[PDB]
Symmetry: D2
């Protein structure tokens, strides 16, 4: 009663953002979507057209309660940060107040203080090249959009959160062990993120009593996964064959964990990387 | 319903076992206590004399419910392991079916299959001596009671548990980083426990579809903690001053995490060490 | 006989770069210095003036053999990457061929193929602000100069290295555990670096048979350490008081390890973070 | 000179003990072998009959030098620990001073203080059974012989060692990640060993100025490796195909690392697990 969560990084219903939204809904948490401008209008259209009606069903009792849907770009911290090419762009020209500070302000102006924050987004222009062939521009882009965006989101959203609020992001084990196709500095971005989760936990915990953790998810066939070089088909087959738990990993499996970590039940957990991957991370040798 | 939990390692209401019991009770889980014979009688008398009535209060809306109390010694796998001296000992003479196998059979005969199992016990004859000064007997004692007991509980209880059951144990960071005062091969035992948790997640996940995880708890002033000599006041004071979250760590804080890991909501987590310690583990240098 | 090492990141003799140069010298490795342009001329002047003569003494037998000293800026991958403000800058206008590709070319043109590479440099414009107050520009700068620079150096220098060559960089435990004054995204930069060391180890090992590792050094009172917010005086006092080995950490302590990892003796070690810190990293609770 | 190393765990020339001996010999270190009584006689006869002559060749410039060969059983701390049956056993009846304390005293009486100590031994009665199926006796046997033996060697040998001495042992990644086939509580034992290495680095560093580290070696086809059942050919084949460095892992590869960690050149390293495994440990998914 009175819980609000902003979920940054929803493009459709096949990702972890949706799975997190669903499980939170089971707890009656009011959901707000942060949607990347290039895919905002298409998302809105699909929604209006009922494409997601089946995916919104929680069970016999209720449908997902989406409070709001807002364009959100993690590339830009403030209004001042947008360049001419973006201002003049087909998809952006028709929207506004989609930088991180603007979204924080706008949510606060519409619904007040919130208490749950979800970072569920990543990007890397050069993800299809291996680390050794990644440019400076490509590397920094991955860190900017996949790691720095977490820090920015915290800096701006903490002003509009209640004490004892909770924050999560999503990571991948490629930060810790070598995953060949996970290129473009995504492995690097994820390494920074897991470390940043610790440092942030210190500052937010001491200064605001706010917790932050990260979930290291197993493979899910989402939009962005399909962008990597079959990679995702391999990851999923391998996981289902060699993980300790031979079960299909679902986005709601991550969602049920996200929900717990965002609740008061996990009051004593902060700065952690929690693995939700059917135990795959524990294996050395495939058997 | 049909949720039954066996909690192995309860002697009073001051430890993590009680905190886990209270939190599980809040979710309507049936609780069965396994009590070490040296303190079983004192436990029962206190209970009967209503000495724990206060401690069983949940909401003031609700009160803890305990299905059964059973004598239990995690030193003994089967009846045939019990040495003549122990079986005739003043505190054991009067008790029956207290080995790991017998307690498994007993519970199964009385209530059928269970779906939740808690290892919440440790012991070490030589905990007061630092590692270098620990004898072979002392070290092996510590591993036998604090680590092997977990593997044995698993071997015998997996026959009385349903698929998708969950198992948790409790550990301490001294396994990964040096804590002077944590002697006797206790650090050794917790390191083995945390490694055995992975190995067992493999076997139990593939063969039985059963999860196992361990919680690395922060300092609580329990009965056993005081037996370390003072050490625990130091640990508590240090934790409350330097942890990211500066709040008093409660037994029920661990309880609610335990409860989550035991429920179906952590379906995709297995073989992990989950830290519930106000984030202290993430720190390097104090302030 | 015939070993050449390029050391990127020498400003004076109080850092780890110098300590590495010294120990390598003991093995008769030919040393080449990569010196950051802003401090190139001052370094050259001090050298010419004999300020380092005492610091170059190895022992009774010999003086350090410096093959060459070159301006080197890790901010720039190629000639194309330099902007007008830098081209027009007091200290830069008077030098050339100081981008990473130019240095690789120039060394190769002068001395041929080399077999030992050392990354011993970091920078972060906003190091004095905590992570939460660090800007995008500040964060990315730290990653650009402290982490991406390693990848670039490998991409360009592998063309001019022999099979079985070896590469190292320097890191700090702040990537793994929270160190309060280590701000500006340096903790983040170091986290990316340790992870990048793994990914690089894969690519360089499979494609070129080249090894790469990173040394996680304890505190040394160097130029850059003095830039952090007494921090370094605290770090050193604490380390000398609480590390398992109560001895002054010397730059040559790191140098002797760097030397081993750059030699054939460590033929089977790659992608590792090796701690050289008098064991400090193993402690949880100060005693 | 005055460098003397005791190597505990040698039965033939096919293990890591021999490889460590050869590498130490190359540095003019005096070698003393501690040989388990069940294979001591067979070892001596082979040696005397010149069966190891080939294996002792270093450069063809040089040949291994062995100061002494001693019967040694790491099961027994002192003479008073030896059970009547063992002392009268056919293979033990003829031997004397083979406990940890007696071998320490003996070496001290014969050669004075030593500065290098190698634990290169492990055993487990039930290694063929997976963890879940390991008995209490088997598990405790594995910890007693493979882990406790290290602590005991330390306690008794620290009296016959000089300050700035160094101690190494050998471990395997199955402590940290799951390796099916590594049964008997061997994984448990290696996890305890790796934790005890930190705890002992603390005590030994502060009280004696003595270092201790452990090497996590990749697969070598030793005598003991074949006793696991095949398991080791599998491990080797997997390692040579998937490791960053695709070259055959040799015993002397471990030897040279051991030699570095035992020398004064690793003065600032203590309590670490150093991986010498062609970088396999850093990988997540194969190709
Ligand atoms: N899918 C997997 O297998 C997997 C495994 C581990 C971790 N993850 C992580 O989970 C998170 C969610 O991704 P997903 O797997 O659900 O795929 P997804 O495509 O559903 O989610 C990624 C979202 O990030 C958004 N995004 C990209 N750039 C952005 C920017 N600059 N500003 C704002 N939004 C931007 C995209 O619109 C997209 O909706 C990611 O951080 C990913 O790294 C995914
Ligand atoms: N209290 C802390 O600070 C702390 C921190 C980390 C982990 N832990 C862990 O939590 C668990 C419980 O300890 P606690 O702190 O709650 O103290 P506690 O005394 O409340 O719990 C220990 C219980 O284990 C029982 N026990 C001991 N040996 C037994 C045997 N052979 N068979 C059956 N039962 C036996 C004892 O009777 C006792 O009731 C332990 O595993 C401990 O390692 C405690
Ligand atoms: N000193 C410590 O306590 C400590 C502890 C752990 C790690 N380290 C690491 O050791 C490495 C060496 O630093 P140090 O401690 O010897 O101090 P240092 O100042 O002697 O070395 C840092 C060098 O990096 C150079 N540099 C900065 N920006 C550069 C750029 N854009 N291009 C090229 N060079 C640039 C500087 O000129 C300087 O000489 C650093 O990576 C540091 O992070 C230091
Ligand atoms: N070979 C590998 O693949 C591998 C990989 C990682 C670690 N290791 C480790 O290396 C060490 C040596 O094993 P190895 O692979 O060289 O096989 P090995 O047979 O060459 O070494 C084992 C030696 O230990 C001796 N030993 C056993 N019990 C003893 C006791 N109670 N007292 C004294 N000596 C005893 C045996 O006689 C044998 O000579 C072990 O600790 C093992 O765990 C080996
Ligand atoms: O199965 C592993 C896996 C699949 C998808 C992932 O998400 C991304 C990967 C790359 C990029 Cl550019 C963006 C995103 Cl959202 C991910 O992190 C890990
Ligand atoms: O605050 C840290 C801490 C306190 C108590 C603990 O529990 C024990 C410690 C020693 C022994 Cl012999 C038995 C137990 Cl139950 C523990 O594991 C960690
Ligand atoms: O004692 C810990 C410590 C001291 C100095 C360090 O090096 C730097 C720190 C910050 C910046 Cl901007 C640049 C460099 Cl070279 C470092 O990494 C860690
Ligand atoms: O290739 C991995 C590997 C092979 C052999 C090993 O050594 C032993 C394994 C089991 C037992 Cl009973 C005794 C020893 Cl010496 C080991 O530790 C790891």
């Amino acid at each position: 009663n009175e819980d609000i969560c902003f979920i940054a990084g929803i493009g459709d219903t096949n990702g972890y953002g949706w799975g997190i939204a669903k499980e939170l809904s089971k707890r009656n948490v009011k959901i707000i979507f942060g949607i990347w401008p290039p895919v905002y209008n298409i998302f809105m259209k699909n929604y209006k057209n009922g494409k997601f009606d089946n995916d919104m069903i929680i069970d016999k009792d209720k449908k997902m309660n989406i409070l709001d849907m807002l364009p959100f770009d993690a590339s830009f911290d403030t209004a001042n940060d947008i360049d001419e090419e973006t201002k003049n762009n087909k998809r952006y020209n028709m929207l506004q107040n989609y930088t991180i500070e603007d979204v924080a302000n706008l949510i606060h102006q519409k619904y007040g203080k919130i208490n749950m924050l979800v970072h569920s987004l990543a990007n890397a222009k050069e993800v299809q090249k291996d680390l050794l062939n990644t440019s400076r521009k490509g590397y920094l882009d991955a860190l900017s959009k996949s790691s720095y965006s977490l820090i920015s989101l915290c800096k701006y959203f903490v002003n509009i959160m209640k004490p004892q609020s909770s924050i999560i992001s999503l990571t991948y084990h490629a930060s810790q062990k070598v995953v060949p196709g996970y290129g473009g500095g995504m492995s690097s971005a994820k390494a920074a993120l897991e470390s940043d989760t610790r440092v942030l936990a210190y500052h937010l915990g001491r200064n605001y009593n706010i917790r932050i953790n990260t979930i290291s998810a197993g493979p899910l066939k989402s939009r962005a996964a399909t962008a990597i070089n079959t990679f995702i088909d391999y990851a999923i087959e391998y996981s289902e064959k060699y993980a300790p738990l031979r079960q299909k990993l679902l986005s709601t499996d991550i969602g049920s964990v996200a929900s717990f970590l965002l609740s008061r039940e996990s009051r004593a957990i902060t700065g952690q990387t929690i693995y939700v991957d059917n135990g795959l991370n524990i294996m050395f040798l495939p058997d």
